[PDB]
Structures are given as C-alpha cells and as structure tokens.
Design a protein around this ligand. Structure first.
Ligand SMILES: OC[C@H]1O[C@H](O[C@H]2[C@H](O)[C@@H](O)[C@@H](O)O[C@@H]2CO)[C@H](O)[C@@H](O)[C@@H]1O
Lengths: 126, 204, 202, 207, 439
C-alpha cells in the first residue's frame, strides 16, 4: 500500500510562483507514472502535467505549457510541479496520481489527498 | 474562482424581527498579507443595481444603516439584520473578491405582516382590441397579502403577480383571459371569483 | 483502467484457446512454432522480475499463467506433438528478428538500464512476434489450428490497447511513444494476419 | 457624484456580435479598473469581464472567455464590451461596475454600478407593442404582443407614481410578451417605451 | 583628485600625468561594481558601464566645446552620447586581437577550426572567465547583446539564444572538453603563460602589449580567427573619463582632463606606460596608426561592434558571464546556460519569479523555449429603416421597423395599426421615410 502526500500549496498573488510536491510513501515500483491533475469547485477534473519514472518524457496541458514544469526525484521518490506566472484561472485543488506502468497492475492507482492553490487577483499600492 | 452558496434560498420575516442569512465558500477566502477576509454583502432591491452593504465580512459600507451586521470566518459567513424594515425587501448576495470575482446564489428576503383583504376590479376587453380579432378580460387584485390567492374564471387565462412593495408590503395580481372574436362574442357575461384568506366581480 | 484489463484478459483467452486447441486436436499443424517461441521469450523477458518483489497475487499469478501457458504451447509444438509439426514450411529466420530488435532496444530506449532495456526488447519483440506465423500462412495458405475465436480475441486485445492509448492520451495526458509505436506495428501486423486468414484460409 | 450609464443592449440573433458601452462620470475613469457583471433570472449575479486602469490586465469568466472582449477609451471615459458568438445563455442585464483603488490594501469591492442594459439573444424578430385601454377606482393600459421584454410603462410622463402597479411580463402562447399597468385614482395618459423596437406610444384611457 | 582605473591599464603613466598637473590614482579591484555602491573625482572605464551611471545621475552632464569636440574622433563622442548628452571624455579605443608567437608559429590560424589541430600538435589559451574575451566567438555567428535597429537598441529583443550564440558557446566548451584550454584559466594565467611562451597565441587587447614587451618574445598582433566562415565580432571599448556627480572639484577635474590628459604630451606619456590602443586625439592617433598593432586593433574594431551605452548592459554582462562560467566549468549545458542568461537579463521580473523560471529551466530543459516565451510574456506584462407616426383619438406614438421596400413597410404599419386599433387616413413622406396615419 502506498500513501501520497501533497504539499506546497497556498495563497499567491497573480504572476507569482509556487512549488508543489507529491511524495509517495511505501514500496516503490520499477516503472511508474505520476500525473498532476487539478479540480476547481464545480468544474471537471483536468490533467495538468505528466511524468514517468525513467527518461526525459514530460507532457503538459495546453493551458499550462511553459508555465508549469514537472520534474522527478527517484532518490527521494518525489515529484515536483513548479508553477510560474500564476493567474487566478489556476485556482484549484491539485492532486497527484501514481499508476503502475508495468503489466497486470491495474489497481496500483493511488491518488493524493489534495492541496489548495489560490491565486489572489488583488491590487496593491507602492 | 471560489464558489459561494447561500442559505436559505428565500425566507420571510415580519417587520422588526431578527434575520440571519448564511454564505458558505468552498475554501477559505482569508488574505495572508492583511489578515482580512475578502467577502462582501450586496443588496439588490427589485429593479435596481446591487448596492454594497458590507465588505471585509465585518466592515460596514458608508451610509449603511446600523441594523446590517456582517460576521463569520473560515468558510462560513452570516449577514444579520436586527430589525427588518419593510424597505429591506431585496435579494442579498455574498461576493468574494480574493481570487477572481464570484457571487452567491441570492437570499431573497420577504416581509411578513397581518393579512390584508384584496380589492377585486374588473376590466373588459376594449373596442380597439376587438377590432384586431382578439379579446382580453382582466381581473385585478389590489393590495392583498399573503400572495396565495385563487382566481376562477366564469363565462386561456394567465396570471402575473407584482413583487411585494417596500412601502406598504402588499401584492397585486392580474389575471388576463384571452379569447378570439367568436369565442368572446358567444358568451354574454364574464366573471371572476377571488378566494383569499382575508368576492366575485362580473360584467355583462 | 478497464480497457487494459479487458485487453490482457482477451490476450490470455487467445493464448488459452490456442493451447486447448493444440491439446484437443492432438496436432499443432498450421502454427509457426517460431512465433510461439518468440512469444514465450517476450513473456520471459518482460516478466523476469517475477521472482523478486511481488506486487500482488493477481500480478504474479497472471505473470505465471502467461509464462506457463506459453511454455506449454512451445512444449506441445516442439516436444509433445512435434511429429505433426512441420518445420519445412516454417523456415523463417528468428535471429533476423531478435538481433535487430535487440539493437533497436539498445538504441531507442528511454533510459539505459538492464530492466528498461529488457522491457523495451520485450515490447519490440512482441511487436514483431507474429511475423513467422504470417510467413507460414503466406506459404502454406491454410491454418488447420488457427481458429476464429483465437483471431477474434487477438483483435479484441489489439483494439482494446488502441482504445486504452487514446483514452490515456486524452484524459490522463499519458502516451508512451515506444509502446504506442510498437503497438501500432503489432496492430498492423495483426490486421494483415486477419486479412491473410480470411482471404486465403476462409 | 459617480455615475455609470450603459448602452447598446438589445435583441440579437445567436452567433452575432454586440458592443456595449458604459459612460462614466463624476470620477477619473482612467484611474479605476472596470468590471462587467451580468444578471439573469436563472443565473443570479455573475461577473463577466474585468479591465485594469491601463488595459494591461484583462480577466474573463470561464463561460465567456474567448467570446467576449473588454476594452476602454480612457479620455472618452468609456468602457466597451464586445460580445461575439452569442448564445441563449448570454441573455441578461449587463452592469458596468467600478473597481475601487487598491482593494488589496483598503478592501473595497465593486462599489458603483450602472443601471445595466438588457441583452437578449434569440432568432425571433422584434415586434412593437400594442396598447389597449382598460375602462375604469383604478384604470390601466394593457400592453400586448411585443418582443423582447424590455419595456417601460409610466403614467403622465412619471407625474404620478402613488398607487401605480406595473406587472412583470409573462410568456404568452404566441411567443410574445404581455403585461398590464394599472393605477388607483380618486385625464391619465399611459406612456409606453419599447427600446428594441423604438416604440414610444402615448395613449389615453377613457370609459 | 581621486582617480579609479582598472589594474591592467597604465596607472603609473597617469600618475606622472597627474604629477605634472594633487592628483591621486588608485586601481581597486572590481571597481566597475565598486563605483556605483561607493558613490573618486574622475573614473576611467569603458563606456558601456558609464551610461547606467548616467541613469543613476552619478555622472554630471558636462558641456563640451565645439573645437574640443572636433579635436577628437566623432564616433568616440558618439560612444559617450547617452540621451543626447555627453557624460564622459573618450580617451582610447581598444579592441580584442590575436597575439601569437612568431617563434612558435609563423602564420596565425585563419579560423577557429584550425586551433584544435595546432593545439594538440603543440601538446590558444585566453581569459575565459570574463565574457568580454569569450564574446567574439559567440557573436561571430550573429549573437548580439541587443537588436540595433534605426539607431536604437531594442531591450525587448535579446539575441543570446541565437543559433550562432549556441554554436560559439558549444565550440568553446568543445575546446574545453578536448583539454585545449583550462576551464578555470583567467587573465593572470593567460598573461603568465604567454609571457613564458608556453601558449602560442592568446586573445587580448592593446594594454597587455607592454607586458608582452617585457617578456621580450616576438609577438604578432592580428585578426581574431573567423568562426564558421564569419569574422569574430568583439565588442569595441571606448576607455573614457567620467566626472563624479558629487565631486567637489568638478571644474578643476574637467580642466585637467581637457588641458593635461587629452593632449599629445599627456597621451604620449600614458601610452608609454601601457598601450592605450586607438587614441581619441586626432594628432596622436595619426602619429600612432603607423604601428601594425594599432592597425590590427582598428581593423578588429571595424569587424566588431561597439558596446551599447544603455543601462541594461551591466545586467547583460552579468548574465553572459554567468552563462559562460557555467558552460566552461561544465556545471550546466550550453543551451541551459543561455536560457539562464535570458532569464537573468529580463529586468521587469520579480526576484521570486526569476528564481521560479530558473528552477523550471533547471528541472525540465525539453520545454525551455516555452518557458522562455512565458517568461518574456510576463516580463512585458510587468513593464512600467422606416418610421411610423400614429395619431389616433386615444393613442399617439411612433414606431420604427427594418424594411427594404416601402410598400411592405406600409403594409406592416397598417397591420400594426389594426393591431393597435387605429383607423385613419394615410400619408407617406419618402424623403423622411415616414408613414403617418391620423384620424
Ligand atoms: O565582464 C566583461 C567586461 O567587459 C568590459 O570590461 C573590459 C574592459 O573594457 C577592458 O578595458 C578591460 O578592463 O577588460 C575588461 C574585462 O575584464 C566592460 O567594460 C565591463 O563592464 C564588463 O564587465
């Protein structure tokens, strides 16, 4: 059994930056794939980024490509999502999903609890 | 985007009563920089633009009567009126302006009072309308409360009720029955019987 | 995730149907023993981690079922019922497949590690596994043991991975370019297999 | 005082484009950000668009993004909302609202709103209203067979508003709108204005 | 007076010049960075740093003289022209050039590609730490600091991501990995090695010549080798004299610069200490252009491009230095280093935004182009009919319709009037497009 913990979410101004991290606890698998999804209240769950266990393959949604960047840490068994130039349209609960990419492992499909990212479109006086 | 839900959808309170209405947010709308909760309460009187009542979920906007108070934190907020006036009949919205701008569903506040007798008036179709080939006979219910009142047509009928007025707290209803030229010509008397909690009007 | 489950169950059904037909008919004529050898080697190479770090009873059980069924098919073709087996018409050169596939697994893999190399080699060999059977039927013109159920289950298996790839790419944002390309090659080869069987055997 | 008056609303076919304007006065329009917020009976208040004081920042709602564009002419003190590829769900009363200065510091939300303009989207063509008298005590005018249902009915050009009752328009079986305006009295003219059809009719009521 | 100049220039000759004029000369390290934070009466430095100083107001706008302006070359004055005002007196024009050993080799290499073979046979080494020396190779194939169009530098366009910049940087790191130059060699190492003759050739400016003259090894000064069939484009330096804004002796220092330093005798006494290069004065430059090394410096300057005077040049220099050091030491790849340089140049980005974009570049270089595009977008965002008139007995009004034909228009109006219960005589004014019915 594997437990996923997500951290790094919070309240950031529009255009700011954030670093989310999904840490997996339990016995690692040789070949796995982790996907960052997001869900805003009353909206469908959409995938944000996707990375595998080995290689240089990363896939990004059309909306977040260039702003969001997914990376891995096999030694620490963690996956990081860096959010740059955030806009209030990126306010959602961000989930991390681990799938066993080997054969015959259909039920090795674990979801994180969820982390809250809120982009506050406020104006300030210098 | 932070969704907002409002409860109750609509409620009625007598004049001078204390009323409390709640807004629930899908997440906390507290700002970390200034520790101020970014929620506001707006009041929309019938046929009017929304008017700001409260901001920062506690602070009262300039010119607002003292009977309006804002409270709450986290994901639950309340708007309280200590002495509901007949003028306070409006739709109240909660609005979070931290992440984008979203509004609540709307809590429509009505006014309760003593039952009042309707005034039933009759209005026959005019000659100008008859020249066009159609007729409409209109029955008028003036200054009645409660809104629930039954109208029966005696020889197609659609009834529309006005919103409760803030000055007096009354309702008015109009029941229009439509006929063709032949259908109107066939019958000789037209009547409407009005049953209300607090009378038949006819013409030949 | 049910698409990959259904495809794997269809593939296991096809393997079991072929094994049972060989057992019942008391002959393996019309089957390329080299294709089944390549399938056995695919399952061996992909599931070499069976001994170490079992994940679940279903996982290791399915790996063992696949390995045992393929080995039993190879044994029936080459040891039990080799008399009915006709190697004269199955003259395909297996090394001509294994060596280029091994080189391609070395070159085009995602990462250069023994387990990743083995997985990529197994994927590529599965992609080109059915070629000896295609050659054998293209030569003989008939398949006394290949059944409509076997081909139907194989085609269902391929179509289920096709739908699975589309679903993963459009909902989960996941595509495995090596796996997708090798599976497309395998699907084309299986479509040609069905074409040859219907046009020449039926 | 701060004043925001909108214009441009009316009836359009689905998929068409309409430009709404909001003239602002009583304050420095080039200093404040501006919102467009629409309200419909099955929708409630819904924020639509936002533009900053310098047009640098533009935000749009999820259901309006890619179709609606907000802009502003600062020296002409005008705010513009260009709507393209309109749908039936876009029928609403549209308000232009003023975003106060530095709401992150002082905390003021949308403070001043316009009266709004009705934007209705339907393939049905416009039809001028027909006014009929109601013989009188109370007397009134029945306005029938008009589309859409922006309509302002007053009495004696707003001379008397005590005891006057106007009723909400209801869907008629013919696809048109109809309402009656009545008033209790001890010569009265009912004046009806239908903006989409530019129909201003001044009618007398007699027994 | 208090004077700051770089350590590799002729501070002793300046000392005698000030002695004849008390004048104090000092050569602090990192003075190009010390001067802004500290604030010296007059500072001697290349013009690229000076414009930014003028933005801070640290350089006092000095009124020139028309005859004195004509005493110097016009392009040198153009170098110290920022926003239409002269902030400095040009002193010397310096450009990088190849200095080789005649004993080690008779003919210098005509291209960069020939260098690996000659170096492995000997088994070139210049200062790779500063981006000034490594920029000619980068810019040989079109890499540019800022796009120069119609007399202006477009800060929005930075060319350090060009294919030519990548080609130059990867050529340099290939030479580093092939053990042809030490990754951590600097100016002192280059001078020491070339003085002893260990290195056949090195890239350097006029100032080092006297040092080489002390080594008494015969040296030839010539064109920088061409990279992929295109000439190297070294930035051209205009060593110039800037006045401190807070200098209590501004007039005295200005008079000293005009009447002792920028004269034939003073510049002759300065060039003797360390070669100034192409001298600003017309007379001394004419007397000095006969030397082949000055000719080589001038032709290299013609092949190169003068540095912009814009204040975005310090950030550009820091970013390019970081990228070159990273690529040379092997800590980062060439493309990643150049993307970092682009991120670091972008002025309007917040520090945390810049750190986030740098991290995004670190942990995924497959989408570096998209990250750069998004960062540039954020950086630019943060930049500072017919008519009817009815007149009945009971109702009167007006109504407009959309009609193409007047016959159908009045048919529709007649039907509408019947629906309105109107019966009266009809009139039509086509000019006003009005149908009027009245009872
Ligand atoms: O970092 C590169 C450097 O280039 C220039 O500095 C040159 C200067 O022009 C020469 O006279 C001599 O001092 O070598 C310097 C390089 O160390 C720019 O003037 C300077 O801003 C920049 O940092």
């Amino acid at each position: 059994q594997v437990q996923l913990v997500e951290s790094g979410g919070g309240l950031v101004q529009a255009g700011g930056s954030l670093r989310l991290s999904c840490a997996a606890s339990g016995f690692p698998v040789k070949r796995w794939s982790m996907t960052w999804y997001r869900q805003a209240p009353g909206k469908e769950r959409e995938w944000v980024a996707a990375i595998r266990s080995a290689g240089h393959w990363t896939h990004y949604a059309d909306s977040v490509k260039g702003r969001f960047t997914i990376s891995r840490d096999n030694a620490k068994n963690t996956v990081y999502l860096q959010m740059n130039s955030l806009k209030p349209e990126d306010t959602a609960v961000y989930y991390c999903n681990v799938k066993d990419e080997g054969d015959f492992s259909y039920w090795y499909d674990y979801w994180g609890q969820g982390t809250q990212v809120t982009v506050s479109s406020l104006e300030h006086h210098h | 985007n932070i969704m907002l839900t409002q409860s109750p959808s609509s409620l009625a309170v007598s004049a001078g009563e204390r009323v409390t209405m709640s807004c629930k947010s899908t997440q906390s709308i507290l700002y970390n920089s200034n520790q101020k909760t970014y929620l506001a309460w707006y009041q929309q009187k019938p046929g009017q633009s929304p008017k700001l009542l409260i901001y920062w979920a506690s602070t009262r906007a300039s010119g607002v009567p003292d009977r309006f108070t804002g409270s709450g934190s986290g994901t639950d907020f309340t708007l309280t009126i200590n002495s509901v006036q007949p003028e306070d009949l409006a739709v109240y919205y909660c609005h979070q302006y931290l992440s984008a701008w979203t509004f609540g569903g709307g809590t429509k506040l009505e006014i309760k009072r003593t039952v009042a007798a309707p005034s039933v008036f009759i209005f026959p179709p005019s000659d100008e309308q008859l020249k066009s080939g159609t007729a409409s006979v209109v029955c008028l219910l003036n200054n009645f409360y409660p809104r629930e009142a039954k109208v029966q047509w005696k020889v197609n009928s659609q009834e529309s009720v006005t919103e409760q007025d803030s000055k007096d707290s009354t309702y008015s209803l109009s029941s229009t029955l439509t006929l063709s030229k032949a259908d109107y010509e066939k019958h000789k008397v037209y009547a409407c019987e009005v049953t209300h909690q607090g009378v038949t009007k006819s013409f030949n | 995730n049910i698409f990959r489950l259904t495809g794997d169950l269809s593939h296991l059904a096809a393997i079991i149907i072929l094994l049972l037909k060989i057992w019942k008919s008391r002959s393996c004529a019309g089957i390329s023993g080299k294709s089944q050898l390549l399938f056995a080697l695919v399952f061996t190479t992909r599931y070499l981690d069976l001994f170490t770090s079992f994940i679940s009873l279903y996982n290791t059980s399915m790996k063992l079922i696949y390995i045992a069924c393929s080995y039993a098919t190879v044994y029936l073709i080459y040891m039990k019922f080799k008399a009915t087996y006709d190697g004269n018409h199955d003259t395909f050169r297996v090394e001509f497949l294994i060596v280029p596939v091994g080189g391609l697994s070395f070159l085009v893999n995602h990462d250069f590690s023994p387990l990743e190399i083995l997985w990529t080699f197994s994927i590529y060999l599965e992609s080109v596994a059915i070629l000896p059977q295609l050659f054998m039927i293209s030569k003989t013109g008939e398949a006394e043991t290949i059944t409509t159920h076997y081909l139907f289950f194989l085609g269902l298996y391929r179509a289920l991975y096709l739908v699975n790839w589309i679903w993963r790419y459009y909902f989960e944002g996941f595509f495995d370019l090596i796996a997708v390309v090798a599976g497309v090659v395998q699907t084309v080869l299986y479509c040609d297999f069905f074409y040859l069987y219907v046009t020449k055997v039926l | 005082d701060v004043q925001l008056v909108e214009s441009g609303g009316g009836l359009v076919q689905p998929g068409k484009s309409l430009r709404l304007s909001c003239a602002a006065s009583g304050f420095t329009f080039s200093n404040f950000g501006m919102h467009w917020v629409r309200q419909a009976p099955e929708m409630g208040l819904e924020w639509v668009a936002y533009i900053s004081s310098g047009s640098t920042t533009k935000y749009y709602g999820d259901t309006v993004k890619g179709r609606f564009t907000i802009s502003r002419d600062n020296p002409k003190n005008t705010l513009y909302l260009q709507m393209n590829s309109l749908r039936s769900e876009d029928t609403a009363m549209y308000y232009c609202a003023r975003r106060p200065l530095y709401d992150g510091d002082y905390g003021y939300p949308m403070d001043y709103w316009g009266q709004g303009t009705s934007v209705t989207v339907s393939s049905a063509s416009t039809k001028g209203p027909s006014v009929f008298p109601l013989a009188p005590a109370a007397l009134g005018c029945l306005v029938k067979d008009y589309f859409p249902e922006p309509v302002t009915v007053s009495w004696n050009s707003g001379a008397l508003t005590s005891g006057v009752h106007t009723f909400p328009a209801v869907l008629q079986s013919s696809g048109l709108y109809s309402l009656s305006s009545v008033v209790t009295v001890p010569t009265y003219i009912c004046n009806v204005n239908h903006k989409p059809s530019n129909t201003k009719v001044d009618k007398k009521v007699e027994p | 007076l208090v004077i700051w100049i770089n350590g590799d220039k002729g501070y002793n000759g300046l000392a005698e010049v000030g002695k004849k004029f008390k004048v104090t000369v000092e050569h602090p390290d990192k003075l190009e960075e010390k001067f802004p934070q500290v604030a010296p009466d007059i500072i001697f430095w290349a013009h690229d740093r000076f414009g930014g100083y003028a933005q801070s107001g640290l350089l006092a706008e000095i009124t020139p003289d028309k005859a004195f302006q004509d005493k110097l070359y016009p392009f040198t004055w153009d170098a110290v022209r920022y926003n239409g005002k002269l902030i400095a007196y040009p002193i010397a024009v310096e450009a990088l050039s190849l200095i080789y050993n005649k004993d080690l080799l008779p003919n210098p290499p005509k291209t960069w590609e020939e260098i690996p073979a000659l170096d492995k046979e000997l088994k070139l080494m210049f200062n790779l730490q500063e981006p000034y020396f490594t920029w000619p190779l980068i810019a040989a194939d079109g890499g540019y600091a800022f796009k120069y169009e119609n007399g202006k530098y477009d800060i929005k366009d930075v060319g350090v991501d060009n294919a030519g910049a990548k080609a130059g940087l990867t050529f340099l790191v290939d030479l580093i990995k092939n053990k042809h130059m030490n990754a951590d060699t600097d100016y002192s190492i280059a001078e020491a090695a070339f003085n002893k003759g260990e290195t056949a050739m090195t890239i350097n400016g006029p100032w080092a010549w006297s040092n080489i003259d002390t080594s008494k090894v015969n040296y030839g000064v010539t064109v920088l080798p061409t990279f992929k069939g295109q000439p190297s484009k070294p930035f051209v330096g205009v060593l110039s004299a800037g006045i401190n804004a807070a200098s209590p002796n501004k007039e005295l220092a200005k008079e000293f610069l005009e009447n002792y330093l920028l004269t034939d005798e003073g510049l002759e006494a300065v060039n003797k200490d360390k070669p100034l290069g192409a001298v600003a004065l017309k007379s001394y430059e004419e007397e000095l252009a006969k030397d082949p090394r000055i000719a080589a410096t001038m032709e290299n300057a013609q092949k190169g491009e003068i540095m912009p005077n814009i204040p975005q040049m310090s950030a550009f220099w820091y970013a390019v230095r970081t990228a070159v050091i990273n690529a040379a030491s092997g800590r980062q790849t060439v493309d990643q280093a150049l993307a970092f340089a682009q991120i670091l140049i972008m002025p309007n980005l917040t520090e945390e935004q810049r750190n986030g974009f740098i991290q995004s570049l670190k942990d995924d270089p497959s989408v570096s182009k998209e990250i750069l595009a998004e960062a540039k977008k954020l950086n630019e965002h943060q930049a500072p009919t017919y008519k009817l008139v009815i007149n009945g007995k009971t109702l009167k009004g007006e109504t407009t319709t959309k009609a193409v034909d007047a016959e159908t228009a009045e048919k529709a109006f007649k039907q509408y009037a019947n629906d309105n219960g109107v019966d009266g005589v009809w009139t039509y004014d086509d000019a006003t497009k009005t149908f009027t019915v009245t009872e």
